[PDB]
Amino acid sequence: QLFGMVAQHPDVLTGVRPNGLEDTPQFKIDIDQEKAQALGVSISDINTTL
Amino acid sequence: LKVNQDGSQVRLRDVAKIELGGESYDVVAKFNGQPASGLGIKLATGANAL
């Protein structure tokens, strides 16, 4: 929204830009606790392996 | 927390009361009898108070 406002009034501000990085797709590994406990596998083992 | 012999599961709700409270309950402050909180600032050694 601030960048949209700074797009207006170009006579005072020029070349405004972020100093960071835009969001990127990330891969989410979701562990089902019920299934993990149903098997013999332990959360510490899963996280350590991954 | 665990799953019983049958399909019943034991959550943290079943054995506890989860609420968002203070880290410690020892210190309690009031201002003119009204509830309040505060900060007690102590000056660093060899620093100007003003």
Automatic annotation (TrEMBL), chain A:
Source organism, top-level taxon: Bacteria
Subcellular location: Cell inner membrane
Family indicated by similarity: Belongs to the resistance-nodulation-cell division (RND) (TC 2.A.6) family.
Protein name: Efflux pump membrane transporter
The organism's taxonomic lineage, starting at the top: Bacteria, Pseudomonadati, Pseudomonadota, Gammaproteobacteria, Enterobacterales
Gene: acrB_1
Covered range of the whole protein: 700 to 749 of 1048
